[PDB]
Amino acid sequence: SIDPEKLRDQLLDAFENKQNELKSSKAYYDAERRPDAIGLAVPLDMRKYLAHVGYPRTYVDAIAERQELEGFRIPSANGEEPESGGENDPASELWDWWQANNLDIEATLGHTDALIYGTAYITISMPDPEVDFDVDPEVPLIRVEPPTALYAEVDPRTRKVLYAIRAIYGADGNEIVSATLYLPDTTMTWLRAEGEWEAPTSTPHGLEMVPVIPISNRTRLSDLYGTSEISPELRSVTDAAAQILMNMQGTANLMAIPQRLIFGAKPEELGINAETGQRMFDAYMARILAFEGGEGAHAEQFSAAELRNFVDALDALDRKAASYSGLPPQYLSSSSDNPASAEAIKAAESRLVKKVERKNKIFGGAWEQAMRLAYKMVKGGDIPTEYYRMETVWRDPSTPTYAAKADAAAKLFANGAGLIPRERGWVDMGYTIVEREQMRQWLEQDQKQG
């Protein structure tokens, strides 16, 4: 119905309006100047010496470091045969496209934008040799694109995308040097700045749906568009701690030392120079100053401020930042304690592990959906019914304690007489789908040795 020329112009307006929200979350992950971070006690000329607090970056890194996809799996046809070669396992096609795109860089990279901004988009397409030279022509060209360069409109009635715009600025400026529109029928692209456009380079595609899938950091039902992981709790302790670091630093300049005073001595009796208000005197160690009586003069001093009075509040905000984030206490350094044993580690990181397992559960939904669109685009025919029941398989988020699992798996398997089959011991040791498959071949070769 609506003209693509008019859809482009309204979607670029909506995309530009979103950039007023995203600049807020960016300014916590990159420590840009926040008015609320400036410590109030330091005088106006010293306020150029900003302090910065790394809690938001530390929290988003400590999630995104743990997330890694290790395969897909799909229910087999009747007869239950789990894998095959020559005539391939259908899940190994999806992993071939994952490797051929380098999504093992781009997805784990784009998951940080999904945590920072609350959303990021997966774009599905076929390659064409007019644009690029270093992709396999048989493989669907899948990319991840951030909300600072793509926008999509979602129908709250049915949760699908209606249409989306991908809009890219040039030369570190604000010239919108290209824009692309996605529709259920088609996509169009323009190749110069706004008010100066080329003709729309355009193509059809075979889907009933827009080839843009949102990865979204949704935490509940409601929450339809996803929400930033850097929560108001973690923002408010980051801003609070930055003020304490500025006031402590300001105190270390003006006031972490006594101020010495003399009362009753006349400036001309001390020999103060009239033009400058100063008297120089030699100040090597053990000199004794001797003064005239000054009509009952005496010396006294203002106290130093004790900097511990700020540090014993900084250690309280390092208990809050740990408590809100659920990181291990040694990540914030909230105390001088470290896990002594494998069970002490699994205890200490239990919050961060269950946080990451829930992020793997949520972001896995976007990746299986993007793989269904990629199959439906490449293979052209309607989707085989088992692809509606596929699973993403992810690495165990916990720290890789090897020896504690090695003696456990050896006790369970007991040289083949034990409780579990061989390949169960391999997945309990945490070997990936591609490593387990490779070990079936080395094991078959070892069964020929003597």
Instruction: Give the one residue of 3, 199, 385, 448 binding its own copies; rule: CB under 8 A.
Output: 385
Tell me how far apart the alpha carbons of residues 219 and 238 are, in angstroms, rounded to a whole number.
22
Q: C-beta of 414: minimal distance to its own copies in Å?
A: 6
Candidates 2-10, 34-42, 194-202 — which segment interacts with its own copies by CB under 8 A? 34-42
| Amino acid code (one letter) for 72 | F
- Asked whether 39 and 247 are in contact (CB, 8 A), the reply is yes
**Binding of its own copies at residue 243 (CB under 8 A)?**
yes
**Residues from 179 through 218 that contact its own copies (CB under 8 A):** 208-209, 218
Token digits of residue 310:
């700020």
Residue tagged 């090897």 (tokens): 402
**Binding of its own copies at residue 393 (CB under 8 A)?**
no
Q: C-beta of 78: minimal distance to its own copies in Å?
A: 7
**Binding of its own copies at residue 144 (CB under 8 A)?**
yes
- Asked whether 25 and 230 are in contact (CB, 8 A), the reply is yes
**Binding of its own copies at residue 343 (CB under 8 A)?**
yes
Instruction: Give the one residue of 44, 222, 275, 448 binding its own copies; rule: CB under 8 A.
Output: 222
Residues 148-177: x/- map of binding to its own copies (CB under 8 A)?
xx------xxx-x-------xxx------x
Residue 205: left (phi > 0), alpha (psi -120 to 50), or beta?
beta
Cα 436 off chain centre by: 30
Q: What is the DSSP letter of 387?
A: G
Q: What is the DSSP letter of 235?
A: H
| Amino acid code (one letter) for 226 | G
Token digits of residue 141:
């060209």
Q: C-beta of 244: minimal distance to its own copies in Å?
A: 6
- Asked whether 55 and 321 are in contact (CB, 8 A), the reply is yes
**Binding of its own copies at residue 23 (CB under 8 A)?**
no
Instruction: Give the one residue of 23, 47, 354, 379 binding its own copies; rule: CB under 8 A.
Output: 354
Q: Reduce the secondary structure of 354-371 to three states and give it as a string.
A: HHHHHHHHHHHHHHHHHH
Instruction: Give the one residue of 4, 12, 93, 104 binding its own copies; rule: CB under 8 A.
Output: 104
Tell me how far apart the alpha carbons of residues 191 and 103 are, in angstroms, rounded to a whole number.
27
Instruction: Give the one residue of 116, 181, 183, 433 binding its own copies; rule: CB under 8 A.
Output: 116
**Residues from 55 through 94 that contact its own copies (CB under 8 A):** 57-58, 61-62, 64-66, 75, 78-79, 81-83, 85-86
What does residue 167 show for φ and ψ, rounded to 5 degrees? Answer: -130, 120
Candidates 4-12, 192-200, 258-266 — which segment interacts with its own copies by CB under 8 A? 258-266
**Binding of its own copies at residue 21 (CB under 8 A)?**
no
Instruction: Give the one residue of 11, 91, 183, 240 binding its own copies; rule: CB under 8 A.
Output: 240
Q: List the end-to-end C-alpha distance of the chain, in Å, as a whole number.
A: 74
Q: C-beta of 249: minimal distance to its own copies in Å?
A: 5
Cβ nearer to its own copies, comparing 4 with 431:
431
Q: Is 304 strand, coil or helix?
A: coil
Q: What is the DSSP letter of 382?
A: P
Instruction: Give the one residue of 7, 8, 72, 112 binding its own copies; rule: CB under 8 A.
Output: 112
Q: Is 303 strand, coil or helix?
A: coil
Instruction: Give the one residue of 7, 8, 89, 110 binding its own copies; rule: CB under 8 A.
Output: 110
Total length of the chain = 450
Q: C-beta of 158: minimal distance to its own copies in Å?
A: 5
Give 124's strand partners.
Answer: 142
Q: C-beta of 111: minimal distance to its own copies in Å?
A: 9
Q: C-beta of 5: minimal distance to its own copies in Å?
A: 21
Tell me how far apart the alpha carbons of residues 375 and 9 are, in angstroms, rounded to a whole number.
32
Residues just before a chain gap in the chain (C–N exceeding 2.5 Å) are none
**Residues from 267 through 326 that contact its own copies (CB under 8 A):** 267, 270, 272, 283, 285-314, 316, 318-320, 322-324, 326
- Asked whether 70 and 395 are in contact (CB, 8 A), the reply is yes
Q: C-beta of 360: minimal distance to its own copies in Å?
A: 11
